[PDB]
Design a protein around this nucleic acid. Structure first.
Lengths: 146, 320, 320, 320, 146, 110
RNA sequence: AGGCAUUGAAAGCGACCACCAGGGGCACAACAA
C-alpha cells in the first residue's frame, strides 16, 4: 500500500492533528483545505531557484501565521487538552513543520515529479482528493459507532 | 520577380504530381498568448535540444498537425466568398459545406487542401504541413492564468450560493517562435498566390481565436525543389544549435539566423533546387504579392482563374 | 567513392538472381507524429526486449510491411515523371498506372519494386523489405490526441444541433526509432543509385501524409554480400541489448551504436561480404550520392540509363 | 569439429540407400509476419497439445509440406550461380532451369533435392523434409491485417469511382516457433556442408517473400543415425508437454529446452546413433561452418568438389 | 472469481443509486453518463505512476464536488426529506466511494487490465454501453412501479 | 449574437468581435506602484476589542498616463451592429479589477 | 520614532459532441513430364 496510499492519507491526517473544522457546521471547501491550499499556494508562488529547505522554513511560518488568525476551536492541539502554553505551542509548531515536510518532499517533490507544471494542472484533483479524504476520515471518526 | 516564376509552375493541375514542390520556410512568432491544446493541457513533447552540440533533452511545445493548416485554409475560403467565387447560402449553385457530405468538389480549397466524405470520392491535399515545435523549452515559454465568470451583479453569488465558474488555463507566451515548413505539390502559379496569400493574410491560430492567438508569420525563404526538404523538428534543432542555446535574442536576428540555417541545411538534401528565394529577392517577391492582394482587379482576375483551373481539374480528373 | 563501387554491380539485369545483394542498414527516426495503423489502432506486437541479457517481454510498435516500401516507390515514380522518362497522361506512349491493370511493364519502378495484374504476367521485386519495430516499448513511445471538426461558423452546433465531429487517434511520438534493413537483389549500378535515392530522398510515412509522419532516415551502413543478413527484429533486439535498455540517448550516439552492433552481427552471418561501407566511407559515399541528386545533367544521364536497362530487361526476359 | 565428422560420411553418392541419415534438429522462430497458406487461409490443424500430460486437443498452424524446402533449395541454387558452378543464361553448357526440362541433372540441387520433368527419368530427393507445426495454438499465434491499394493520387477513388482494393490477410506473429527435423540420406561431407549451408543461409519462407516472412533458424542438434527419428508433430508435442504450455519464454530458454527434449526422445528410437552434435560441440561446428561460408577460397573449393561428386554420380548411376 | 467480465449493468446501477435524470426530460448523452465521464476522465488524466487506492478518493471527490454543481432534482439521496442532512451525506459519500471503487478496480483494473492505452481505445464503447444500460434500467423502474 | 455564448442544449455561437491582449507602450518599472491598504475596526483603529485584527496588505496598481495601444475587430456585421460595437467601445470606461473604485480609462479611437 | 498589525472569506468549471462516408478483390495458372 505505502508508496502513495500513506502519502495521500498522511497529507490530511498530518493537518487533522493541528486543524479541524467540525463537520456539523456544514463548512466550505475553502475552510477544510486551509492548510493544503496555503501550502500548495506557497509552493507555486515561488520558482525552484531556491531550495526546498528554505521553502519549508518560510512556508511553515506562513501557515502558523494563518492559523494565528483561526478561532481556537479549529486548532485541536490547543483546544482538546489542558497543558502549559510553551509546550502546547511547541507540539503545534512541530505538527505544522512535519506536515510541511511531506507536502514539499513527497507531494511536490516526488508525486508531482518536483515540477511546478504538473502540480499546477493537478491542484484541483489533489485538492478534491484531500477534500474527500478529510470528510471520509472526519465522518468516520464521528459516526463509526452508529 | 513573379514574372520570372510563372515559368516554374504547371499550366493546369496534373493528374498525378511531378516533383514540382515549392516549400515555404517560415518562423511563426507568437503574439497575444496562444493556446495549442488537445486534452485540456498545452501540447508538449520531449526532444533533443540541438543536432551536433547541445544533445541534452528539452521538452518543447507543439503546434499539433492540423492547428497550422486549418486557420490558413478557412481564411482562403472566406476570400473566395468575398470575391463571390464560392457561396454560403443553401439555395446557391456554388455552395460549399466545409466539413460534410455537402462539400463542393471544385473550388480552390477542395482541390488544394483536399476533401474526404461523400459519394464523389475524395481528394488528397496538395498543401503539406507537419507539426511545428517551439524553439525554446516549455518551462520558459508558457504561463497559467486564472479565469473567472461571475454574475452581472459583479459577484460570484446570485442567491447567496457560489457560482463555481473558476478555473486556470495554460497559455503560450508572446515572442515564442515555432519554425515551420509548409510545402505545395504541383500547383499552378495562381494556386501558389492563393496558398502564399493565406500564409501572409491569416493571423489567428489555435484555441479561442476571438480573444487570443495572433501570430507574426515571417516568411524566411521560398525554395522550389525536386522533393521535400527537412522536417520542422530538424529545422528547430538546427536553429537552436546555431543560436547557441541562447534563444533570448531579437526577432530580426532570429529571422536572419533562420535564413542562414535554411541555406546551410538545403545544401545537404538530395534534391535539385531550381530557385531559392531568400534575402532581398524574398523581400521584393513578398512586396509584389502583397500588391496583388491589395488590388481588387488583380486579385479577382487571379483567383477567378484559379477557380476555373480547379473546375477543370474537377471535370477532367476529379469528382466530375 | 562511387567510382570504385561500379565494379561490384551487374552490368545489366540478369534473368535469375545470382546472389549479389546490396543491403541498406538504416535507422528511421520519427520527426513528427506518424500513424502506423491497420484496423483503426497503432499496430503493436509482443517481443523479447533484447537477444541475451534483457529477456523480458515487451510490446513494441510495428511499421508493418508495405508502409516503408510504398513511400520509397511513390517518391521514385515521381522522379521518373519529373525527368520525363514515364508519364501520367492516359494518351501517352510511356504511361504507367500504379497498382492497376494499366501498369507499365518496363519502367524502373516496375522492374525494381514489381507488379502483378494483367495478361503480360508479373515480376517479383528486386527490392526486398521487412516490417520494422520500435526500438523502445509502446507505452513510452505513443500518445492519443483527440480531434474535432467544427462547422466554419467556429462552432460544433451551427445547425442548432451538435456535429458528431469528435473522436480520438493514437500517434507515435517524435524521437522514436525504427531500425530497418532494406535489401536489393541483383541490381545495376544505376539501379543502386535509384533505390539509394529513394531511401535518402523520401520523407513521409504512414497515414495522413499531408499533415504528419515526417521521418529522418539515417543510413548507418551499406553491405555488399553473398546473401541475406539479419532480420529487422534481430537488429532491433541486438541494439536494445547493446543500449542496455536505457534508450533516452542522443540520435547521433544511437547511430554509432547502430553501426557498431551491425558490424558485430555481420561477423556471425554465413555470408561472404565484399564491401562493408560504414562510418567515414559512408559519409563520403552519401555526400557523393547527394551530388548526383543535386545536379540536373548527372541525374538525367544516370536514370535514363536505368530506363533503358529496365526496358531491355522487359523486352529480353520480362513481360515483353 | 568438421575434421572428425568427415569420417562419418560416404566418399561418393550410392545408387541405393545405405542408411547413413543425418538429421538436422531445428527450431524455426518467426521474426516478421510469415504467411503460410494454401487456399487463401493460414494452414491450421487440430492435434493433441502434448504427448503424456496435457492431452487436450488444440489447433496449431502448419508450415506445410514444401514451404520448408523450396526456400532452402532456391538459396543454394543462387549460391551455385554466384560461385559460377551453374548459370541461368540460355546457350550455356551449365544451365539449370528450375521445374522444367533443361534442369541440369548433374548439379547439387538436381542430385540432393531431385528432378522429375521430361525425358531421361527422375531422381528422389536425398533431402527428406516434413510439414512443421506451431508450438503454440493458432489463437495465440496469428493476426489479420487489412491491405489497401489507393490510386497514386493518394486516395481510393480515381474519378469519383471507388477502387475495390481492400482486403485482409492473416499473418503469423513474430517469436512463434516451428520445431523441425529435416533429414539428409547418403550425403558426402561437402553435400552435408551444402544442405547445412542452405539451413543457416536462408532467411525468408512464406508468401510475399518480397515484403515479409523473415525467420531465424536455430539448429539445436545434428544426429547421425541408421534411419529416421521421431516425427515433427512428435517433437512439437514433446516440447509443449515439457513446458506444460507455459510457452511465453525467451528464445534461448526455449532452444535450451528443445535440446533436452530432443535427447530424451532419441533414447526411445530403434536407431544406432553414431554421433550426436549438441550444445558446445554444435556451437563450435556452426562456427567452423560460418568460417567456410565467409571465405571465397574455401567455399569455391568445397562446392566445386560437390559439383564433381554430383556430376560423377550423374554419369555413373543417374541421367547420363 | 468472475469479475474479469460482465461488469456494465452493476457499474451503472451503482451510480443510478445516487445520480439520475428522467428520459421524459429528453436528456443529453452528456447528462445520462455524467458520473462515469468524471470517473474515466480522472483515471485517464492523473499521472500514470499513481496506483489504484489514491485514485478512488480523488475521483470520488471530483464527483461529489460536481454533483453539488447540480440541482437536487438529480440526487435521489440528498432529495429524500425523510432523513437528517448529515445522514443523507453519510449515504451519499458511501454510494460515491462504492461506485468509484468499482470504476477504479473493476472497470479500469480488471476489465481494462489496469492499462490506460486499453482503457483509452475503448472509452467511447464503454460509455455507450452505460448510456444504453441506464435507459434499460429506467425502463425497469416504470415496470416495477406499475 | 455579436460577442458569443456556449452553455446549453440550444447550441453555441462564436464572437463576431475579436480582441488580443493589449500591452503597455512603456515598461513595467516606469508604469506601476504598489500601495499599502488597511482595514481598521470602525472605532477608527486596528484594535478590534483589545487585540489587533490583521487586515493590511499591499497591492500593485498601474499609473495614469499609461497607454495600451489596441486593435479590436468586428466581422460580418450590419450597420446597426457596428453602431452597437463602436458604441460600446466609446461608452464604457471602467476596465480593471475594483471597478467600484478604479480603472477608469479613455479609449481614443485613432 | 515608537508599539502594532502583511490579510480575510467563498468559488476550483459548466454544457454538449465522441465520428463521418465509401471500398471488402483485382489479374492469370489448374497441371508438367
Amino acid at each position: 500500500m505505502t508508496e502513495k496510499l500513506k502519502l495521500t492519507k498522511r497529507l490530511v491526517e498530518e493537518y487533522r492533528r493541528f486543524y479541524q473544522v467540525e463537520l456539523s457546521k456544514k463548512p466550505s471547501t475553502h475552510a477544510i483545505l486551509l492548510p493544503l491550499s496555503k501550502a500548495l499556494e506557497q509552493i507555486l508562488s515561488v520558482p525552484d531557484d531556491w531550495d526546498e529547505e528554505e521553502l519549508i522554513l518560510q512556508g511553515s511560518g506562513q501557515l502558523q501565521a494563518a492559523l494565528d488568525r483561526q478561532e481556537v476551536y479549529t486548532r485541536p492541539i490547543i483546544k482538546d487538552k489542558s497543558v502549559a502554553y510553551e509546550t502546547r505551542q511547541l507540539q503545534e509548531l512541530e505538527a505544522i513543520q512535519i506536515f510541511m515536510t511531506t507536502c514539499v518532499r513527497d507531494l511536490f517533490g516526488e508525486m508531482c515529479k518536483g515540477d511546478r507544471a504538473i502540480l499546477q494542472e493537478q491542484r484541483n484533483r489533489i485538492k478534491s482528493g484531500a477534500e474527500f479524504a478529510y470528510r471520509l476520515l472526519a465522518l468516520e471518526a464521528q459516526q463509526n459507532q452508529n | 520577380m513573379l514574372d520570372s516564376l510563372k515559368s516554374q509552375f504547371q499550366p493546369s493541375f496534373p493528374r498525378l504530381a511531378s516533383g514540382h514542390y515549392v516549400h515555404f520556410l517560415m518562423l511563426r512568432h507568437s503574439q497575444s498568448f496562444p493556446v495549442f491544446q488537445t486534452d485540456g493541457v498545452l501540447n508538449t513533447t520531449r526532444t533533443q535540444a540541438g543536432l551536433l552540440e547541445k544533445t541534452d533533452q528539452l521538452s518543447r511545445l507543439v503546434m499539433f498537425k492540423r492547428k497550422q493548416t486549418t486557420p490558413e485554409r478557412l481564411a482562403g475560403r472566406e476570400l473566395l466568398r468575398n470575391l463571390g467565387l464560392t457561396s454560403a447560402d443553401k439555395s446557391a449553385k456554388n455552395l460549399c459545406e466545409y466539413n460534410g457530405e455537402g462539400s463542393c468538389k471544385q473550388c480552390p480549397d477542395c482541390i488544394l487542401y483536399g476533401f474526404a466524405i461523400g459519394d464523389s470520392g475524395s481528394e488528397r491535399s496538395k498543401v503539406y504541413s507537419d507539426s511545428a515545435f517551439s524553439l525554446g523549452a516549455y518551462e520558459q515559454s508558457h504561463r497559467s492564468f486564472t479565469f473567472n465568470a461571475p454574475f452581472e451583479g459583479g459577484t460570484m453569488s446570485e442567491a447567496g450560493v457560489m457560482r463555481s465558474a473558476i478555473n486556470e488555463l495554460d497559455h503560450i507566451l508572446p515572442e515564442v517562435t515555432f519554425p515551420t515548413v509548409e510545402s505545395l505539390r504541383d500547383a499552378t502559379y495562381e494556386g501558389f498566390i492563393y496558398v502564399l496569400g493565406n500564409l501572409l493574410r491569416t493571423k489567428r491560430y489555435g484555441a479561442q481565436e476571438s480573444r487570443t492567438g495572433t501570430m507574426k508569420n515571417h516568411l524566411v525563404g521560398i525554395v522550389f525543389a525536386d522533393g521535400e526538404i527537412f522536417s520542422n523538428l530538424h529545422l528547430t534543432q538546427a536553429l537552436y544549435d546555431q543560436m547557441g542555446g541562447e534563444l533570448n535574442k531579437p526577432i530580426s536576428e532570429l529571422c536572419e539566423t533562420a535564413a542562414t540555417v535554411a541555406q546551410d541545411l538545403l545544401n545537404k538534401e538530395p534534391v535539385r533546387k531550381s530557385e531559392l528565394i531568400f534575402g532581398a529577392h524574398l523581400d521584393t517577391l513578398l512586396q509584389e504579392v502583397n500588391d496583388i492582394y491589395q488590388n481588387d482587379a488583380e486579385l479577382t482576375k487571379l483567383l477567378g482563374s484559379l477557380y476555373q483551373q480547379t473546375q477543370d481539374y474537377a471535370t477532367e480528373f476529379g469528382a466530375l
